[PDB]
């Protein structure tokens, strides 16, 4: 049910095609082991012919007859075998995949649409809670996981039955208690394998989790770097914790590693154990009873069974996951909560006109406990009027303006439109009949026209034309390029909020209501526009009855009535002069107011070269690698031997021959490998450890040392970098361990196979190598195309989903709801196309998969057939075919390798290239001399000449175009610019973060072009807007490890002293010892700046960069700090730059720079004397 069933609902000819495909799956699995059996009977006839071949030494002609007999005979049998099966799979494989999509396909389509409309209907809850972000995200993420859940489930079914029926059909049928010898030994061994192996496997995971914890404590902060570049470079705290925990769980999860290893050793040691009881119990039960050399088929086949239970397991996992996902957040999906609103049938007050009536309504936000903002409120408002709501402490005004749209049903009491109660009339209708314009005016990415059209679907540009013009929009929309068809460069990002807002008004204007709510509308907008905007509002509302809430008491006046609010609290109602005449709230408040990137450079064999660089040595590992390899073909022969030396030979000793080869198979594989792993995993794994550590280090310092427009002008977020660090070291480790499983698999498969290929008598050797390359080639080609379709669909769906987020992500739609389905509808179209395309690709997956299995039979058949070729009287055609199985199984061996161990190279090589380009870099500023700190360079006179520059992005021309100023010593360079850039760039430039594109500078005596950077920054009393401190105790922060500068206590005290942060230092728990506590949050920026300043005056500079420092503070913070910055200066030169146009008066040389070019300068009154620019600045300052 629900879980599983709801999970699998929706589907007539769906459910039917489904059960059909399941069936195909069934028969298919059954194919694999039937195929086993037949391999058996062909093999038996093969023994009989080899047995009499063994006898030989007699009637030659009867050998030519007995032989061409079974030859051509089983030759017929082989034919009908590849046939029956072969054709079989092709047909049914294609069928089970047609299961996959036909099913999941339609099933999701249905899902998809229900959810789209579902979300769009959850209404005010979809704001009430839900990250919304986390939502759309889940829309796609989950929807898809459902998909995988369905077609893979099919895969399982199929295998569930090749295992079930195999282990059965043969696991019993053949042997009658011998097949049980199977059941017995076999399933039992298989038991020890499953347990022990899986035991450690869980053990492994636990190892990996503890790893993860250590890796986070391997992270810490890595941002704020600007502050940290003027700091120097942590460099050692990072390494410290890094290699600490890493090494730890390195070798540790590396024991579980060398335990995954020790695990390969498990399953495999225990694999050859299989071989043990396998052959053992076999041989005994082959010299006594059931003497066939065909126990093979049986036991061997039951083995196939185990393997299949494996594949079945991952498929099942898939199912369950997709279930959990959909099903649970499906009740989140399907489910039709709503009721807090709806958008269907209802009541219709077509009387048009009427008065609003807020009657005795209490209400608290959706968040169950906040105060009932509307704490019992009554109000009424006549028609054609326009009422002003006046509040400030938030939480009310806006809200009544809220439910006046039924946004939320009234907690208690009620409201009435016209004369009926809001709740009673239908929504779509209400919402329409209620024009509304709030602050944030949002415009979807489209033409102006289309946005107004959103206001009203059907409607002709003649009406829009009217609309705009009515909302004074007609002018700009006309001069602006393209006209109404002009767009809106992705989101409402292209024009001024002023016009945005206007456009809106137009939108709502075509909606043409009878109620109009203006939520501060005009607000948060430039003054002049505010005018124009309110202007359009005016020409809009009187026709309509309107409730407006706002702060511009200036635009309040003309209120037919006002009401007193201020954070949920109704009081004084009435006309202006009345609420002023009251000298109450109105009057009161009235007077109070007066992460993408991927790069082309690869690294052909380079990270190999550099590999070994990132390497000490471990030939040892590669050593056993070679052995592991041989180990495999070895098996090929040891087995081929058994069967051989028992399918044709001398009677006595066959027990010892058996028994021997049996144990041989065990001791050999079992041990050798257990070993192989243990060892190799030890050495090579350790290579992964180190490589990754000495790597995270290498890279990190590369960054610390790096700098300049890296973060100075990036698109390499803190994340992108923490990312790089962790993920990349890992990956690379991968590129090296890979070179290892390379020499290895290599020798094994080929080398060994080829030698034994010599003993191959050129008729199979060749017979196969042709086959393996082709079937191998399939593995590849198939997976390839499978990816193409996967990604491309991700694209089409991306168009759709991208736009479905546009909506859900923009709820400021339900506002009008005049799009709803219309919306998700446009997306119904998009889908539509990717849907038809989906049915096809369904088919595709099928044909492909199938064709692969057809290769299955083709391969085998041709093989065994050709091999057998010519056994007329006993010729070069006999047992050797078993070594043929050896080279076929060889190709399959290497297959294990590609589909196992480290990341398919790839992502690892990519990651390598990446972390390599990053580790290469250009220090740009480590050491250097460019002076020798001469014991006189203390003057501190700053020189800026020519100074032309633009932070790399130069196309936006520079913000410094031919600049030149300077600053005497022990004094104060006053900086007053336009805004933002300019003041910053200057500072920086001194800090020589970015070097001027032309011209030069002299902190005193010579090219702050070429002066030793580290020293240049030795002196820099820098303190900016947003201070900051990494979490050391403030005593340490204070002690900002500028360099060798030791934590001079009394020094840190000197700072705290003139810092005036001492006020917190005197008492405040733990005093200096108090860590910034939680990275900061526990102290006002005022105190913070006190510390920053400390830091600085602790450095005992000579020059100072006071970048608008206090430009966000208040009273005694501001002031006291100016007292700090005060005594902080005059002892040294300092460019105090700011937007404190006021307190800037105490300046030595005040320069008025106009972004790029300096236009005014001199002393204050002298500047005013120069009535003009600086003047206007002071005249606006008022
Ligand atoms: Hg599919
Ligand atoms: Hg609130
Ligand atoms: Hg090895
Ligand atoms: Hg800038
Ligand atoms: Hg710190
Ligand atoms: Hg200053």
Curated annotation (Swiss-Prot):
Key words, A-Z: ATP-binding, Cell membrane, Cytoplasm, Glycoprotein, Membrane, Nucleotide-binding, Phosphoprotein, Repeat, Translocase, Transmembrane, Transmembrane helix, Transport
The keyword Mitochondrion belongs to this UniProt entry's keyword annotation: no
Residue ranges, Cytoplasmic side: 102-150, 201-258, 317-618, 685-739, 782-841, 903-1182
Activity regulation, short description: Translocase activity is inhibited by verapamil and is sensitive to energy depletion. C1orf115 regulates drug efflux through modulation of ABCB1 localization and activity.
Catalytic reactions of this protein: ATP + H2O + xenobioticSide 1 = ADP + phosphate + xenobioticSide 2; ATP + H2O + phospholipidSide 1 = ADP + phosphate + phospholipidSide 2; a 1,2-diacyl-sn-glycero-3-phosphoethanolamine(in) + ATP + H2O = a 1,2-diacyl-sn-glycero-3-phosphoethanolamine(out) + ADP + phosphate + H(+); a 1,2-diacyl-sn-glycero-3-phosphocholine(out) + ATP + H2O = a 1,2-diacyl-sn-glycero-3-phosphocholine(in) + ADP + phosphate + H(+)
One example of a Gene Ontology biological process annotation: cellular response to lipopolysaccharide
Binding-site residues, ATP 1: 391-398
Signal peptide: none
TM helices/strands, residue ranges: 12-34, 81-101, 151-172, 180-200, 259-280, 295-316, 619-639, 664-684, 740-760, 762-781, 842-864, 881-902
Glycosylation sites: 51, 55, 58
Assigned protein family: Belongs to the ABC transporter superfamily. ABCB family. Multidrug resistance exporter (TC 3.A.1.201) subfamily.
Additional remark text: In mouse the MDR gene family includes three or more related but distinct cellular genes.
Protein name, as recorded: ATP-dependent translocase ABCB1
Taxonomic lineage: Eukaryota, Metazoa, Chordata, Craniata, Vertebrata
